[PDB]
Every structure is written in C-alpha cells, then in structure tokens.
Design a protein around this ligand. Structure first.
Ligand SMILES: C=CCc1ccccc1OC[C@@H](O)CNC(C)C
Length: 375
C-alpha cells in the first residue's frame, strides 16, 4: 500500500508533465516559427492541442480518481470530464485521418494542394473535425444515451458516488464504431494507398535516371558518332521528361536547365564530332549526375523519413488505443471476462500515448531544429 500510493502518483505526475511539456513545445514551434508553418503543420497543431487538452483536463483527473478512493469534484464536472475525454480521442483520430487524406491530396494531385488547401481551408477543415467530434462526443454524454439499462450501476450515477463509465450496449457499440473503428479504417486504407503511390513516383524518377546511365555508359564511349546522336537524342528526351515531372521546385528546375544545356552542347551544331567534344561533353554529364544523386537521394530520403514519421504516429496511436477499444467490444458481447483492473490499465495505455507524439516529431530534422532553438 505504502509503495503503490507513491509510485503510482509519481508515474502519473511524470506522465502529466511529459505530456504538457511535449505538446506545449510542439504547439509553440508551429505557432512561433515561420520555417514550419503549413497545412500539414496546422493539422499537427490541432492534434497537439487535442493531446494537450487530454493531458490537462483528462489525465490528471483520471489519475486522481484511480489514486483516491472515490470522486471529489461532484456529480457534475464528471460528465464534462468524460465528455472531454471522449472528445480528445475522437478529435485525435479524426485529425489523423485528415492528415492521411491531406498527404494523399499532396502526393497524388499536386498543383491543387497549393491552390485549394490554403490556411483558411485548413482552419475550416480542423474546425469541421472539432465540431463533428464535439457533436458525436458531448451530446451522447450530456444526456440519457450513455446511461446503463441495469440497476447496479444506477447507484453510481447519483448520490455523489462513482464516475466509472458503465457502458450500455447500444452506446458502447455505436461510439466504438463511429468514433474509432470508422476513422481507423479510412485512415489505414488512405495511408496504405499513400505508401503504395509514393514508391511509384520514386520509381518513375528512378527509371528516368536509369535510361540515362546505361545510355551514357554503353553508347557514348564505344564508336560511331551517329549512334551518339541516338543516345543523346534519347538523353535529351529523358532529361526533358524528368524536368516536366518549398525549394524543391526551384532547385530541381534550375538543375535540369544546366543538364539540358550540357546535353545540347553534346549534340553540337557541327556534327561528326566523335572524340573532340562528344566524349568530352559526355564526361561532364558524368559529373552532373554524380552531383545530382546527392540532391535526389536527400529528397527521397527526406520524404521516406517524413512519411515514415507520420507512419509511426499513425501506428503508435493504433498500437496504444486499439487494445482498449478491442476490450470495450468484449464487455458488451459477454461480461465477467475483464474486471476493473486491466480495463483501467488498457485504458491508461491510450492516456500515455498523448506524450509519445512530440518524441516522434523529434525524429524529423525539421522539428528537432525548432525544438533545439526553443529550449
Ligand atoms: C467506448 C468507450 C468510450 C470512448 C469512446 C470514444 C473514445 C474514447 C472512449 O473512451 C476512452 C476513454 O476516454 C474512456 N474514458 C472513460 C473515463 C473510460
């Protein structure tokens, strides 16, 4: 008893401070800096604000309730506590779904994400998500929908006792489906499509830079300047195609301008060149692609890091909250399987998850620099 009452208190307090500190840093980095201020970062700010509300008005009260013997704030301020608890989870999972949809709308069809998905549209989307979550969270709790249809619990709904959820079958199933299981399917499908499509765009650019290496390696330094025209004609077309398909747009466009100019110098205007400049210009092309791989690999690595960073967050959320939501479905199909010991523990797993988001953000170099220049 003596060891538990202090160890649990220390653990919960450390979790509270970790959640508040991390989410405050994540919010401040977006809200104060200018380098990282975009629609995806606006959605990140919405998620961080939801998790901050979870760490402020949900986690400490649940910790006090589990640490103490009974509620203390009254029969009211317990409906609000549960409402805010459900709202934070719903507005986190739906914000994650919006993030996945956004990262699908900016990898599949660009030139529209920079024209329609503006700051005003991002604000509208996050407001819509928050209002939808509020409508599906507060309204059932604030009235008789969440009440249980049996008399053992009714003692804990009044007379200033208890704050346990006491799930009723209909509301439990409806909330576990609408709030979590519906967003967790659209979310997973959309993000899996994003990963299936991102590889394709990388593959399209990789092969465009393959039809140049074998072109340069095989045809240029063999013979018959006539076919050097054929290789260079193929080289120009593939270079132009890659050029046709954030400093990325500026840097890549100017980079391909140099490559095309070098290609034209290799094509010359007084042909029969053979050795005097066709091979000499070919060697310079070898420097160009050797100095382009560095930029191209850096960008591909950055995207495969940025996407996997969001993949970890969308994976950490599932691996933390799904164990709880797979138990709520058990409590309705057949009771007496789980007592109120691992139900609290599995629930508290999702509570801890609110602090894992800022640590995952530190993996991204863009966020890490903002964190360092803020502490
Ligand atoms: C289905 C359970 C209620 C619920 C619905 C949607 C999101 C989260 C939900 O519950 C997770 C915890 O917030 C429960 N909170 C009470 C204190 C147990």
């Amino acid at each position: 008893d003596e060891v538990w009452v202090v160890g649990m208190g220390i653990v919960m307090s450390l979790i509270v401070l970790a959640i508040v500190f991390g989410n405050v840093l994540v919010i401040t980095a977006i809200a104060k800096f200018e380098r990282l201020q975009t629609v995806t970062n606006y959605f990140i700010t919405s998620l961080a604000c939801a998790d901050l509300v979870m760490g402020l008005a949900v986690v400490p009260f649940g910790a006090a309730h589990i640490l103490m013997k009974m509620w203390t704030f009254g029969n009211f301020w317990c409906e609000f506590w549960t409402s805010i608890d459900v709202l934070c989870v719903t507005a986190s999972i739906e914000t994650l779904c919006v993030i996945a949809v956004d990262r699908y709308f900016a990898i599949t069809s660009p030139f529209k994400y920079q024209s329609l998905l503006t700051k005003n549209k991002a604000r509208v989307i996050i407001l819509m998500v928050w209002i939808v979550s509020g409508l599906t969270s507060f309204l059932p709790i604030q009235m008789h929908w969440y009440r249980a249809t049996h008399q053992e619990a009714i003692n804990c709904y009044a007379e200033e006792t208890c704050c346990d959820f006491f799930t009723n079958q209909a509301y439990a199933i409806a909330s576990s489906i609408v709030s979590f299981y519906v967003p967790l399917v659209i979310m997973v499908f959309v993000y899996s499509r994003v990963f299936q499509e991102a590889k394709r765009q990388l593959a399209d650019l990789e092969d465009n830079w393959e039809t140049l290496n074998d072109n340069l390696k095989v045809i240029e330094k063999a013979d018959n300047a006539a076919q050097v025209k054929d290789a260079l004609t193929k080289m120009r077309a593939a270079a132009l195609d890659a050029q046709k398909a954030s400093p990325e747009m500026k840097d890549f466009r100017h980079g391909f301008d140099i490559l095309v100019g070098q290609i034209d110098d290799a094509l010359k205007l007084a042909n029969e060149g053979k050795v005097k400049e066709a091979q000499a210009a070919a060697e310079q092309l070898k420097t160009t692609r050797n100095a382009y791989i560095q930029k191209y690999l850096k960008f591909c690595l950055k995207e495969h890091k940025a996407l996997k960073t969001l993949g970890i967050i969308m994976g950490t959320f599932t691996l933390c909250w799904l164990p709880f939501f797979i138990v709520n479905i058990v409590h309705v199909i057949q009771d007496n399987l789980i007592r109120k010991e691992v139900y609290i523990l599995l629930n508290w797993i999702g509570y801890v998850n609110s602090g894992f988001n800022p640590l995952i953000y530190s993996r991204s170099p863009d966020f890490r620099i903002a964190f360092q220049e803020l502490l």
